[PDB]
Design a protein around this ligand. Structure first.
Ligand code: CYC
Ligand code: CYC
Ligand code: CYC
Ligand code: CYC
Ligand code: CYC
Ligand code: CYC
Ligand code: CYC
Ligand code: CYC
Lengths: 96, 161, 160, 161, 160, 161, 160, 160, 160
């Protein structure tokens, strides 16, 4: 029914039996810059693509190169610009 | 327009999270098969005029469609049909090397169905030539690339029909 | 990526891509394992970069967190560490893709019109990523910190 | 006293929080091995006079610790020593079944290192006994559950040494 | 838990475990994949429960929040809603144990002697729990009504 | 019209083939989620009138829209807006139990953009209300069904905006 | 699918699904893999089914192969077995669905006009489905063949 | 009844019965013995549930037996508990018919005018059946609280 | 029985029976017929399970058959079959109760003071009944030899 207070240190001050006696872990939370960064929606499936390619600049206007003509005495740099004139004015190939 | 790298970075971007290990094992999966991808581009680009020509030789010509009454009878419509089939071959390699079919969904499969109704070209003979093409590359690029190559060929057939 | 940037470079000229460009893909993917090893230790040390590079920032420049400044208060200091946390996510995105183009297409198009409107000084937010560069390279080894530091230098180069 | 469920409640009670998604996988790793540990205990108890037989047969029998100039020699001290080895095995059944070594630290490891110097029995033979009990047990139960039983064996050996 | 008192009933006789209660441990651990599913539903709508269990309590016994009562004040309800919020924490501990000793060791044993000292009536906090029982069983389906309401019953019958 | 079981049927129908091996495991993937969709749909149907009355208080009250001039000012319109939001909940529980989001395009999002543009309904306040509704019903069904419910609101939510 | 027509019956009265229909969903699903191996015997022996059903098609009505009719000649009899192939594919869908609505959406709602505008009498078609009834139920154990017989007989009743 | 829900829908479209509807009747017949015996223990506990239901009514809603209520005096409450007996009279074949519709005939289609015409508040009798809800399903088994409590949701939601 | 172990588990703490414990009784009733199929396989195959496994004990321990030991060839090895036949009878008593105690109260409680007075090795009985149940698990199935496996191993750990 009772036990000597020196004997309770033998019983319950071990490493395994200390978490039920006093506080031991004291979890710090998520820091507030992390929980400000989540979109308050931790799961999403098909609508990933609905926020991906479907934002309003259709990433075809920032993904496409232009053609200059700084190199008029170069010959192979000329030939891919002349095709770029053909593929923008007639905008198919003019080969057929 | 995406990639195996871009559609995992941007898919983790819009979630707001960092690179998960499940996203990382997808990223290293594309990194293991990179010598398969770069060798497959060089073989298809080598005989691209030749790899079209067997695919027309099985499915289209010496038939009624080369005969008048067919769609591709005249020489304008015959030379366009090789060019309109060249885009299905060439953009599949861009669909192969990106590891994603988003090349096809943005600049091949945008308005492809309504153009083919508007021109009178049969869709069903076109996609039947694609199934003639998806075997002749597999006997030419090798075994391992042709299993990967035909999947993006099937993304055209899942969209054209 | 360099695969995305070389497809559309070959798409406008509308032919199959050259082996001079294909070898740059082959050097990209064969070095692909090393760049995930740069990124996956930064993501595992994500919290213990931003807490120290933020504290190195406010110690170096005190007027930002001082009252009257923009980031005064426990809420405003917290949201001015997310503005640092967002760039560490993009730098780990730029390390994986190999190029600076997932930062250039996301992070740095209109920063000089964003922070002019929000009121924060653009010179001070370029100091924080310099504190982020001095933290994250110390957490990386001797060889690999140079290739990670170039994408840190482009972010300071876009704001300044 | 407490087990793997009571401790992870008591780890999450004194923080004041609820059971988060960082502690449910501590329960889900326990409940996945819940069927594994109950089959591990039911082969211990059927062999519990043979695990203690084969343990002393590799360490203590035919040595000179059971010589007449020895600690074991009188048969009062033998039958205690099997029984002092019974109580190391039976509680090692319990902590494997609980998933937490807290029952070992209350009753077995109460004052056991300070009783043994007060009695004069050697400690360096006892760690040789339980580590001989460990290699018998893992062969009998299985190499999965012998690994988790080997932790709670050596947790007694960490406390004796 | 069941496992932590099946040990003690087998330890005080100095026996190994009988196979009758080894069925009881084995049926418990395959029920663990569905009992935590009850507890994730309970902690997901705690603020829907605690606000509703307050308003179902204070309409029933309006004397404790009317002045002259113990919970009178703007902040004194906010502790007294928090003092009822703790029993929702423990019932989710009692759900995942399959037992009632985490209710007992934490929220039963000296609960008559606290509220005798602080001055709140002991049945008036018990009527909040049966008001909390009526909403939390309305959160769940039929097969989770008795499995959650049994631990709600034990906290009512101990305090009253 | 379009179910999930019919979706793998109709893809197998237009090929003219039968139930292939990939078509069976996709069909058996619906059955493996079969206990989740039934149990969650009982939970939402029992708590329909409380998940609505939290969602309008979380986003729509105490603003310009509940004041004079707002589109939910009068007792016709505020009683209409509860009913007009309750069809978004009831059809989303149809789409969960179907397992396919194509029941929303047949019967919800058909002329819905043409109505609200002609009525002066704020579409961005509606899509704020369903986005507040998606969070609060995820706490009532758990995280497993919360992803499957969370898809089918945002198939409605992008059909509006 | 039964989950189609249990929705549109609940959508017709602007109602949720009643719990008298929810157990019809759940007991369909957990017994759903039983319907897979029933349908696997159909596609596993579809050449077996189509061979020894058409022979007794020309035994109970032996005049469809006679001249002056539709199925006289090798190509014109091949459109019958081409149309016999188009039937049991739907009953393979009909077993798996639980409802007969894939057969309703595909192969019954115009047959009353499209065959007399083609030249095939329905009373000869209705023998041809019931000739399959004697062999498709025979290719399966009679517990599982009783409910398997409970789908294509609806098509004969929708022909007759 | 569940047979009525099928053979007026098939009567409207001038059709026979689909076998997807026919297995709802087949699963009803097998689940008849599980359904009838719930009503057998409801009929045994007829004079049990009604007694505390008024004690759950009048302790929460005391305005009816206060002077100034419709159920004032012992003659009126003896009819009032008799009227709550009429709703339990309605419920014990709702777990025989399988669904709502005999309650829909005899319970709910005149209730919003008649109790208004008889001077009683409609919410109080709507309270009296939802206070009956907790003391009926707890008086039976734990699995069948969803079954017998299913038709209590119609009686709650129609009056309120 | 598992009913009988449940009451004295509740009567020691003076308690009505827990509804989680009645789940073990309700699972025992619906699996009551399966254990009778377990017990008839032992009683039907008794003459092949006793003479074989006793001969396995005599091959493992040939000390038993030799004179000077406990048994001898003419009836003492025959009466060590019937002293081994009693335990197989007690297992079949134990598995139809779902409990250990029909093995306990008939053939455990005083076996050490019995067999010391009888002059047999009690450990050889334990190795003999281990040889008995090694072939008993391979008799019936792999599924039913696990929960009847939990009553096999107890008698091994009762002799020593
Ligand atoms: C050949 C296998 C089949 C066939 C083809 C045929 N196609 C065309 C014409 C067009 N095809 C396209 C498609 C694209 N152009 C693109 O740039 C891209 C993305 C890379 C695609 C997918 C277009 C836009 C046209 C023609 C429109 C125009 O000429 O302005 C034709 C020409 C039709 C005509 O009448 O000129 C033909 C004949 N026809 C067959 O018979 C084969 C089955
Ligand atoms: C008691 C909980 C509530 C209440 C009851 C109350 N009822 C009456 C009188 C009648 N009530 C009914 C209603 C029904 N009768 C039915 O048979 C059915 C099921 C089909 C219903 C819903 C009717 C018809 C009467 C008239 C007498 C009769 O039973 O035929 C009274 C008496 C009122 C009077 O003026 O005499 C009372 C008090 N009133 C409450 O306040 C409670 C909410
Ligand atoms: C003078 C008449 C006129 C207007 C108004 C106009 C707007 C306009 N806004 C655009 C994009 C945009 N507009 C917005 C604006 C918003 N998105 C939001 O979420 C907010 C609600 C809102 C601002 C507060 C954004 C974010 C884009 C970027 C599109 C992209 O994602 O690529 C674009 C396409 C690209 C561009 O030019 O920027 C146009 C043309 N054009 C015109 O000729
Ligand atoms: C990933 C690309 C991306 C960027 C660049 C981005 C910037 C961004 N920074 C913001 C605020 C902010 N950012 C800061 C940051 C700082 N204050 C200082 O003085 C320091 C110099 C600095 C950090 C080192 C502060 C204080 C605010 C709040 C502004 C205010 O409240 O006045 C806001 C408005 C509120 C918010 O959404 O956080 C945006 C959109 N958001 C993005 O998604
Ligand atoms: C689980 C809780 C528990 C503990 C801790 C326990 C410990 C325990 N072990 C003991 C003795 C003993 N311990 C040993 C030790 C050994 N045997 C050997 O021969 C080897 C040398 C060595 C182990 C390999 C011996 C020989 C004794 C008897 C000492 C004596 O009688 O003088 C004693 C003294 C009892 C006595 O001698 O009368 C206690 C209390 N009993 C318990 O129930
Ligand atoms: C989990 C185990 C646990 C229990 C049991 C617990 C009870 C508890 N209730 C308290 C206060 C309180 N509790 C109430 C509660 C109520 N007033 C009423 O009228 C209602 C009947 C009732 C709740 C519905 C009030 C008013 C106080 C403040 C008492 C005061 O300040 O005088 C306090 C003192 C404030 C504090 O230390 O934070 C404790 C410790 N705390 C615990 O951690
Ligand atoms: C699944 C939906 C579906 C239906 C309903 C369908 C009917 C169908 N039956 C056809 C022909 C045919 N159908 C039959 C019918 C029969 N053969 C006999 O001997 C019997 C009397 C009878 C059936 C048991 C015959 C003989 C033809 C060829 C007719 C001809 O060539 O003129 C044809 C035209 C040829 C073709 O199959 O392409 C159609 C479209 N096809 C479909 O895809
Ligand atoms: C169900 C509870 C129960 C048990 C267990 C039981 C046992 C029992 N075993 C007995 C004998 C015996 N048992 C053995 C058994 C053995 N000798 C060996 O060599 C082997 C190691 C070993 C068994 C495999 C022998 C030889 C005898 C006869 C002893 C004698 O006649 O002196 C006898 C005396 C003769 C008889 O009536 O059969 C009893 C009563 N009675 C019971 O009511």
């Amino acid at each position: 029914r009772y036990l000597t207070p020196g004997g309770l240190s033998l019983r319950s001050m071990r490493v395994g039996t200390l978490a039920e006696k006093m506080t031991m872990v004291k979890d710090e939370p998520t820091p507030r810059f992390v929980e400000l960064g989540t979109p308050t929606d931790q799961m999403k499936g098909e609508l990933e693509i609905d926020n991906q390619i479907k934002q309003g600049v259709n990433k075809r206007r920032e993904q496409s190169k232009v053609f200059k003509l700084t190199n008029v005495t170069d010959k192979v740099a000329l030939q891919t610009t002349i095709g770029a004139i053909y593929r923008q004015i007639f905008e198919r190939d003019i080969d057929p | 327009m995406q990639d195996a790298i871009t559609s995992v970075i941007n898919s983790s971007d819009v979630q707001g999270k960092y690179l998960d290990a499940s996203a990382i094992q997808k990223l290293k999966a594309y990194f293991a098969t990179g010598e398969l991808r770069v060798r497959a581009a060089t073989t298809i680009s080598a005989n691209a005029a030749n790899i079209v020509k067997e695919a027309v030789a099985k499915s289209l010509l010496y038939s009624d469609i080369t005969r008048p009454g067919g769609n591709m009878y005249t020489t304008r419509r015959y030379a366009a049909c090789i060019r309109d089939l060249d885009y299905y071959l060439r953009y599949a390699t861009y669909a192969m090397l990106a590891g994603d079919p988003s090349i096809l969904d943005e600049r091949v499969l945008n308005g492809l169905k309504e153009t083919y109704n508007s021109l009178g070209v049969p869709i069903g003979a076109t996609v039947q030539a694609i199934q003639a093409m998806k075997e002749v590359t597999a006997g030419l690029v090798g075994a391992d690339a042709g299993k990967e190559m035909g999947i993006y060929f099937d993304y055209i057939c899942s969209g054209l029909s | 990526s360099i695969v995305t940037k070389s497809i559309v470079n070959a798409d406008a000229e509308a032919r199959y891509l050259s082996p001079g460009e294909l070898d740059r893909i082959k050097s990209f993917v064969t070095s692909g394992e090393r760049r995930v090893r740069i990124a996956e230790t930064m993501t595992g040390a994500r919290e213990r970069i931003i807490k120290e590079a933020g504290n190195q920032l406010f110690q170096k420049r005190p007027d930002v967190v001082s009252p009257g400044g923009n980031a005064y208060g426990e809420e405003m200091t917290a949201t001015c560490l997310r503005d640092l946390d967002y760039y560490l996510r993009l730098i780990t995105y730029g390390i994986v893709a190999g190029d600076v183009t997932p930062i250039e297409e996301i992070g740095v198009v209109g920063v000089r019109e964003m922070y002019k409107s929000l009121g924060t000084p653009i010179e001070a937010v370029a100091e924080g990523v310099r504190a982020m560069k001095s933290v994250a390279t110390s957490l990386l080894s001797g060889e690999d910190a140079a290739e990670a530091g170039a994408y840190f230098d482009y972010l300071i180069g876009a704001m300044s």
